[PDB]
Design a protein around this nucleic acid. Structure first.
Lengths: 216, 81, 150, 87, 206, 66, 96, 129
RNA sequence: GCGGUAAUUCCAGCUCCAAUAGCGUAUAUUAAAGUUGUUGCAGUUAAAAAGCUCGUAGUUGAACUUUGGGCCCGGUUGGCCG
RNA sequence: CCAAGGACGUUUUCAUUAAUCAAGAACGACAUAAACUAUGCCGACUAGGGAUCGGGUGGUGUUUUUUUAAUGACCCACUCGGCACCUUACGAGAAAUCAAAGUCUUUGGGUUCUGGGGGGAGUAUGGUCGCAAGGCUGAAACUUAAAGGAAUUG
RNA sequence: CUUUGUACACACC
C-alpha cells in the first residue's frame, strides 16, 4: 500500500496523470518517490562510490558512509541523489529514494542535418559545483560519450549516445563533478533556442482541473 | 521598473536630472532683459553673470558675480527673455 | 581624465540644440564682428571676449551668430597672437612658479607642480608643432620663458 | 523542434514566462501561474473560464512581479489606470 | 475589461478615507511603489485610492478563480488582524493561520499542520517573511497588503494600503471578503451594500 | 564537389564490401557503423554462415589449411 | 582587459613575455642550459658503464629499517664516483 | 578611455537582457552599432530600436525581446579568411543550427551565412545568439 | 605504503590476470598540462600589483562625409507538368 | 606674505591635443617598510537605503538683522563630486567574503608589471648607485612529497 | 555549558 499525502500523489494514484511530462510542464514539486516509480517503471540505479566520512569527537571517531546514486532511464529522465548514513544498505536505500525525487529531463538534439532520432545534446552547456566546471558539447554520430567513466555512466543513463566533455578544476572530487554534470544536463532545458521562439497557449494545471479527486 | 518609456520621460523627472543626464543635454540657464532706474537702456544679461555687468551709458552695475547664479542689485526690473 | 590629479568631476557647458539661435537677438553679424575686433584691439584673450559678449550683450556663442568662430576672424582681421592663449597662460604660470622657486627653495611641492606644469607645456608644444601652428625647432626653455610672456 | 519528416519530437515543450519571455525550468520552484477568472455581464465569475499568466522565479525574486503583473493586466484590458508606460 | 459597475463608489471611498488608508509611510520609499500621489508635507505620503480599489478587485478575481474555497490560506502574525482573518475564515472557505507560523508548514509533509494551498494571503510581508519564503518553495502565488516601504520581493498582487493603522487593515480585509462574496454569487445585489458592518473586523485590546 | 566525389566513393566502397546496407547511403549512417558489421564480413564468419564449418574455429582451421 | 595586451600589432610583446615566462619552467630551463650535458653524472646518456670501487651498506630512510646493499663505482667516460643500488635479493654476491 | 564603442553597446545590451528589462539606452552610436543592431533585428533577436540624435553623437533606445541569449564583440578585429569562418563558428557558437557570427566585409557588415553565400570574407566584429 | 612470528605487498608452490611472437627497464620528447594560457591561467588572504608621480620608445584611441527609392536583363536552388 | 590644487557653476576658448607606460627623472617615514585597501591605471553598465563633507538649484518653508529687505545659519526636495557606512545576492568565489574581488568555458573594452611545488636563497658571483651601511638586477649545484589557503568537530 | 584563539589531531605529556 501507498496512501499518499499530496494532491499530486493522490491524482497519480487515481491514474489521472498518465505521463510525467505534465509535472515538468507545470513545474509541480515532486514530493513522494512513489509518483516517480509509478510513472517511470523502467529506471535503473547504480551506486558510484561509498566514501567513509569521519566526525571526530572527544571519544573516538564516529564513522558514517556517504553514498551517491545515479538513477534514470535511457531515454530522457535522470536523477542524482547523495545521502550519508550510519549503515551502508540504508545509504543506498535513501540514495535511490533521493535520486528518485530529483528526476529531470534532457534536451536531446542533433549535431547536424536532423535525420533520424536525436543522438546528442541541442547546445553546449556547463555546470559548476565547488571548483569543478563541466562542459558538454554536441558530437557527431558514433563519437560516443568521451568522458571520465563516472560521468560517462551518468550520460549513458541519460540517453545520449555521443557528447564531447571538457573539465576544469579538481575533478577528482566525485560528488562535485557528478553535481556539476547534473547541473550541465539540467541547463539543457534552460537554454532558449529559435525552435522554441513560438508562443504557446499556456495550458491549465492538472492540480486545478481535477480538483475534486484531490485531498478534499 | 523593468518596462518604461525612455523615449518620453515625464516632464518632472526630466527637469529633475542633471543637465547632462537628460535625453538630449541642454542648458538650464537663461537670459534676462533688465531695465535700470534713470536712463531706460534695456540690457540683456546672462543669469550666471560671471562679471560686474553695468549699463553702457553709465556705471550703474546690475549684477555681481557669484559661484552659482549671480545676484542682481536692489533696484532693477528684469524679465525672462 | 584629469591626468595631473585624481578628480573625476564633470562640470562644463551644455550647448543648446538650436544651431540657428536664438530668435530674440536683433543685432547683425557685422555688428558683433566689429565688437570682437574693437574688443581685441585693446588686448583681450578670446575667452574673455566670449564671456564679455555673453554677459554684456546677448551672444550665446559667436559661432552661431556669425558663420565662423572667434580667432578665425581674429586671424582674418590680423589680430592673432604669436602664441595661442592656453600655452601662453601655461608658460606664464610656469614662470610665476619658477619665480616662487627661485625666491623660496624649500617649497618642494612647488617643484612637483612645476614638473607637472612643464609636462603640460611640453604636451601642448608637441601638439602645436605637429599641426604647425608653431614652427618646428620651437622649444620652451626658462630663459626664453622669462621674456616670452611679453 | 522536428526531425526531417513529421514525427514530433522534443518531449515537454516548456512554458515561457509572460513577463521576460524566458523559458521556465522544470525545478524552478519559485515560478507561479496566476489564474484570473473572467466575468460575464452579471458580476459573477464562470468556473473553468480563465486567463492565465506565468511568472518566472527571477522576476518574482527581484520584486518586479507586481509591476509586470500590472503591465500585463492593463494590456489585456481588465485593468484601467494603475500601470503607466511613462515612468 | 469590466462592465463598469465595479468603479470606486463614493460611500466605499468615504470608508477608505474614514479609515485613513491613504496615510502611507514616511519619506522612506520602496522604488517599486508608483502608487504615491501628491507626496505631502511632514513627509507622509498619500496613495492613489483608486489604484488600491482596482488591485482589490484584481485580488477578488484571483480568489474567485480557485474551485475549492478551502485551498486559500490567510496569514496573520501581526497582532492587529487575527480577528479579521478569522472572520474571513468564517465567511469563506479560507483556512487561517493566526499567530505563530510554524516553519515547514508548506513543505515537510510529516508535520501535523501540513497545508499545501493554491493561494496565500498576507498582511505584512515584513512581519510574515517566513510565510512568503515558504510560499516561494512550493510554487504558491502571494497576495499582500503592502506598504510604501514593505519588502515587496516574492509578492505577486500587492494591494497598496497602510498596515500601521487599526482601521485600515480590517476594513480592507472586509472589502476583500465583500468583493469575493459578490463574485462567488451569494451576495446577489451589486448596488446594495453588505449587512455585516466593518466594525466586526477590528482588533480590541482585551 | 570534394564532398560529393569522396562521399560517393566512400559509400560506394562500403556498400561494395557489404559493411553498409544498400538503403543506408546518406554518409551519416557511415558515422553510425560499428565494428561488428566489419567483423561479420570476414572469411571466417562467411565460411561459418555458408554452413561449411559449423563453428568459427573450424572455419579458421579450414581456411588456414587451404 | 585581463592583463596581457590584446592589440592587433602587439605580437612582439607577447613573444618576448612568453620567452621570459618560458624560462620559469623547470624542464625548459634544464634543456636549454645544457645541464644534462654539463652537471649530470651520465652526461645526458641513458646508461653508463663503470668499474666498481667498493660496497656500501646504505641505511633506509624513515620510517623504514633496512640496509640497502649498494656499491660505489667509477664511470669510465668521466671518472666521477657514483653510488648505485644493486636491485634484487642476494645479488650483492655477483658484483664483488 | 572609451576605446571600442561597439563593445560598450553590446555590453549594455547584455546587462539589460540579463536583468530582464525590455529597453536599453546606448551611448554614443557609431555606424557599426546601427548595422549590428540591423543584423540582430532582421533575425528576430531584438526588435525595434530608435536613434535619438543630439548634436554630439546620438543615442540608441532598443526594445528588447526575450529572444536574446548573449551578444558579444570580438576585440581586436582579426583578419578572417574563408577557412577561419567555420573555425570561428566552431570556436564560439553554441550549435550548428543557429547562432550568427558577424563580420564586416568590403560588401558591408553581415552574418557568416550570407557571407558564405556571397563568398566573401573580411574582419570579424562579433557574435549573437 | 608492506615487512617488528596469524605478510591478500617480501622468498617459493598453486590458482588467476593483462599483452602476446612479443613483453619489460632506462633516458629524451609529445599528449595528459587551461602546470606557458593567442585561443586559454593567476596576483586581497594560497607564488605573484613595481612605494607614488611625471615621462621617451612600444601598444591603444570619441563621433561625422552615398543613404534610400525605383526600372529592366539574365543565372542557381527549387515547383505543379513527370 | 607668496604661488599652487580639487569640486562646483558656466549658452567662455582650444580642438583630439588622449589612456597606460621599457629607458630616464622628481619625491619618499642614503631610495627602504606589514610603503596595506595585503586589492595597478583608464572607460562603460548592473539592487538598494540612510547619514555626512564641498558646491549649486528651487521651495510665498523657519530664524536673525532694520518686525520686515539681500545675506548668513537651519529645514525640505534635488543634483554633481568625495571619504565612508548598513541590508541582500541576480552574480562571483575554494571559502572567509565582494556593488566590486560582478558583467569571466554563454571564455576578447584598452594597457603596464609580476608568478609557475617547498628549501637552498634574495645566498654566491658579475655589473650598477652609494662616503659607508647598504639599495637594484640576480642564479646554479644539491635536497624534498609535500609546504600552503579557507572553513567544520574536538 | 556558550563565546574566543590555535601552527594542537598518536590532540598541551
Amino acid at each position: 500500500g501507498w496512501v499518499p499525502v499530496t494532491k499530486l500523489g493522490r491524482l497519480v494514484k487515481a491514474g489521472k496523470i498518465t505521463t510525467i511530462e505534465e509535472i515538468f510542464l507545470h513545474s509541480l514539486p515532486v514530493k513522494e518517490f512513489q509518483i516517480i516509480d509509478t510513472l517511470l517503471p523502467g529506471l535503473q540505479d547504480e551506486v558510484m562510490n561509498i566514501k567513509p566520512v569521519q566526525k571526530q569527537t572527544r571519544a573516538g571517531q564516529r564513522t558514517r558512509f556517504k553514498a551517491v546514486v545515479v538513477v534514470g532511464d535511457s531515454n530522457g529522465h535522470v536523477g542524482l541523489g547523495i545521502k550519508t548514513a550510519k549503515e551502508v544498505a540504508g545509504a543506498i536505500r535513501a540514495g535511490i529514494i533521493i535520486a528518485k525525487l530529483s528526476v529531470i529531463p534532457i534536451r536531446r538534439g542533433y549535431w547536424g542535418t536532423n535525420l533520424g532520432q536525436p543522438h546528442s545534446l541541442a547546445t553546449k552547456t556547463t555546470g559548476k559545483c565547488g571548483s569543478v566546471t563541466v562542459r558538454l558539447i554536441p558530437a557527431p554520430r558514433g563519437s560516443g560519450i568521451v568522458a571520465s567513466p563516472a560521468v560517462k555512466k551518468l550520460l549513458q543513463l541519460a540517453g545520449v549516445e555521443d557528447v564531447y566533455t571538457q573539465s576544469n578544476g579538481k575533478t577528482r572530487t566525485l560528488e562535485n563533478t557528478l553535481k556539476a554534470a547534473f547541473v550541465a544536463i539540467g541547463n539543457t532545458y534552460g537554454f532558449l533556442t529559435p525552435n522554441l521562439w513560438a508562443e504557446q497557449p499556456l495550458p491549465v494545471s492538472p492540480l486545478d482541473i481535477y480538483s475534486d479527486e484531490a485531498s478534499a | 521598473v523593468l518596462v518604461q518609456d525612455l523615449l518620453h520621460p515625464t516632464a518632472a523627472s526630466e527637469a529633475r536630472k542633471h543637465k547632462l543626464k537628460t535625453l538630449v543635454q541642454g542648458p538650464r540657464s537663461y537670459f534676462l532683459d533688465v531695465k535700470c532706474p534713470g536712463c531706460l537702456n534695456i540690457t540683456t544679461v546672462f543669469s550666471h553673470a560671471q562679471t560686474a555687468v553695468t549699463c553702457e551709458s553709465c556705471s550703474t552695475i546690475l549684477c555681481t558675480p557669484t559661484g552659482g547664479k549671480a545676484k542682481l542689485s536692489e533696484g532693477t526690473s528684469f524679465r525672462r527673455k | 581624465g584629469r591626468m595631473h590629479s585624481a578628480g573625476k568631476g564633470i562640470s562644463s557647458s551644455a550647448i543648446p540644440y538650436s544651431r540657428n539661435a536664438p530668435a530674440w537677438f536683433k543685432l547683425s553679424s557685422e555688428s558683433v564682428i566689429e565688437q570682437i575686433v574693437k574688443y581685441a584691439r585693446k588686448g583681450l584673450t578670446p575667452s574673455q571676449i566670449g564671456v564679455l559678449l555673453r554677459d554684456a550683450h546677448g551672444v550665446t556663442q559667436a559661432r552661431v551668430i556669425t558663420g565662423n568662430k572667434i580667432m578665425r576672424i581674429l586671424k582674418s582681421n590680423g589680430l592673432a597672437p604669436e602664441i595661442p592663449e592656453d600655452l601662453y597662460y601655461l608658460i606664464k604660470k610656469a614662470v610665476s612658479v619658477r619665480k616662487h622657486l627661485e625666491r623660496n627653495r624649500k617649497d618642494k611641492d612647488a617643484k612637483f607642480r612645476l614638473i607637472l606644469i612643464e609636462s603640460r607645456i611640453h604636451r601642448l608644444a608637441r601638439y602645436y608643432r605637429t599641426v604647425a601652428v608653431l614652427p618646428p625647432n620651437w622649444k620652451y626653455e626658462s630663459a626664453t620663458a622669462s621674456a616670452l610672456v611679453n | 523542434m522536428e526531425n526531417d519528416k513529421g514525427q514530433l519530437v522534443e518531449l515537454y515543450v516548456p512554458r515561457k514566462c509572460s513577463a521576460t519571455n524566458r523559458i521556465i525550468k522544470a525545478d524552478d520552484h519559485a515560478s507561479v501561474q496566476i489564474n484570473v477568472a473572467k466575468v460575464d455581464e452579471e458580476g459573477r465569475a464562470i468556473p473553468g473560464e480563465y486567463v492565465t499568466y506565468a511568472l518566472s522565479g527571477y522576476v518574482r525574486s527581484r520584486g518586479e512581479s507586481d509591476d509586470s503583473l500590472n503591465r500585463l493586466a492593463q494590456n489585456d484590458g481588465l485593468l484601467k489606470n494603475v500601470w503607466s508606460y511613462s515612468r | 475589461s469590466l462592465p463598469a459597475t465595479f468603479d470606486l463608489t463614493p460611500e466605499d471611498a468615504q470608508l477608505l478615507l474614514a479609515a485613513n488608508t491613504h496615510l502611507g509611510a514616511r519619506n522612506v520609499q520602496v522604488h517599486q511603489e508608483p502608487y504615491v500621489f501628491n507626496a505631502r508635507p511632514d513627509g507622509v505620503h498619500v496613495i492613489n485610492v483608486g489604484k488600491t480599489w482596482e488591485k482589490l478587485v484584481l485580488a477578488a478575481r484571483i480568489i474567485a478563480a480557485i474551485p475549492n474555497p478551502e485551498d486559500v490560506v490567510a496569514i496573520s502574525s501581526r497582532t492587529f488582524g487575527q480577528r479579521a482573518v478569522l472572520k474571513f475564515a468564517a465567511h469563506t472557505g479560507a483556512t487561517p493561520i493566526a499567530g505563530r507560523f510554524t516553519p515547514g508548514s508548506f513543505t515537510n509533509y510529516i508535520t501535523r499542520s501540513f497545508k499545501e494551498p493554491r493561494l496565500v494571503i498576507v498582511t505584512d510581508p515584513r512581519s510574515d517573511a517566513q510565510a512568503i519564503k515558504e510560499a516561494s518553495y512550493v510554487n504558491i502565488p502571494v497576495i499582500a497588503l503592502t506598504d510604501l516601504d514593505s519588502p515587496s520581493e516574492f509578492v505577486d498582487v500587492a494591494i497598496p494600503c497602510n498596515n500601521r493603522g487599526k482601521h485600515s487593515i480590517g476594513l480592507i480585509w472586509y472589502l476583500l471578503a465583500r468583493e469575493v462574496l459578490r463574485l462567488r454569487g451569494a451576495l446577489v445585489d451589486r448596488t446594495q451594500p453588505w449587512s455585516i458592518m466593518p466594525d466586526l473586523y477590528f482588533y480590541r485590546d482585551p | 564537389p570534394k564532398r560529393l566525389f569522396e562521399g560517393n566513393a566512400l559509400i560506394r566502397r562500403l556498400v561494395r564490401v557489404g559493411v553498409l546496407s544498400e538503403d543506408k547511403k546518406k554518409l551519416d549512417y557511415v558515422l553510425a557503423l560499428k565494428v561488428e558489421d566489419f567483423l561479420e564480413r570476414r572469411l571466417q564468419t562467411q565460411v561459418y554462415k555458408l554452413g561449411l564449418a559449423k563453428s568459427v574455429h573450424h572455419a579458421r582451421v579450414l581456411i588456414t589449411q587451404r | 582587459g585581463k592583463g596581457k595586451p590584446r592589440g592587433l600589432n602587439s605580437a612582439r610583446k607577447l613573444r618576448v613575455h612568453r620567452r621570459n615566462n618560458r624560462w620559469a619552467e623547470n624542464n625548459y630551463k634544464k634543456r636549454l642550459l645544457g645541464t644534462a650535458f654539463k652537471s649530470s653524472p651520465f652526461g645526458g646518456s641513458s646508461h653508463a658503464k663503470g668499474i666498481v670501487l667498493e660496497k656500501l651498506g646504505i641505511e633506509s630512510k624513515q620510517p623504514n629499517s633496512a640496509i640497502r646493499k649498494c656499491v660505489r663505482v667509477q664511470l669510465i667516460k668521466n671518472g666521477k664516483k657514483v653510488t648505485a643500488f644493486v636491485p634484487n635479493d642476494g645479488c650483492l654476491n655477483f658484483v664483488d | 578611455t572609451r576605446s571600442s564603442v561597439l563593445a560598450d553597446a553590446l555590453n549594455a545590451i547584455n546587462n539589460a537582457e540579463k536583468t530582464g528589462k525590455r529597453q536599453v539606452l546606448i551611448r554614443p552610436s557609431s555606424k557599426v552599432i546601427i548595422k549590428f543592431l540591423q543584423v540582430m533585428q532582421k533575425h528576430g533577436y531584438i526588435g525595434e530600436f530608435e536613434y535619438i540624435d543630439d548634436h554630439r553623437s546620438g543615442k540608441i533606445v532598443v526594445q528588447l525581446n526575450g529572444r536574446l541569449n548573449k551578444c558579444g564583440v570580438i576585440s581586436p578585429r582579426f583578419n578572417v579568411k574563408i577557412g577561419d569562418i567555420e573555425k570561428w563558428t566552431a570556436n564560439l557558437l553554441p550549435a550548428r543550427q543557429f547562432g550568427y557570427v558577424i563580420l564586416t566585409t568590403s560588401a558591408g557588415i553581415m552574418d557568416h551565412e550570407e557571407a558564405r553565400r556571397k563568398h566573401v570574407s573580411g574582419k570579424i566584429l562579433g557574435f549573437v545568439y
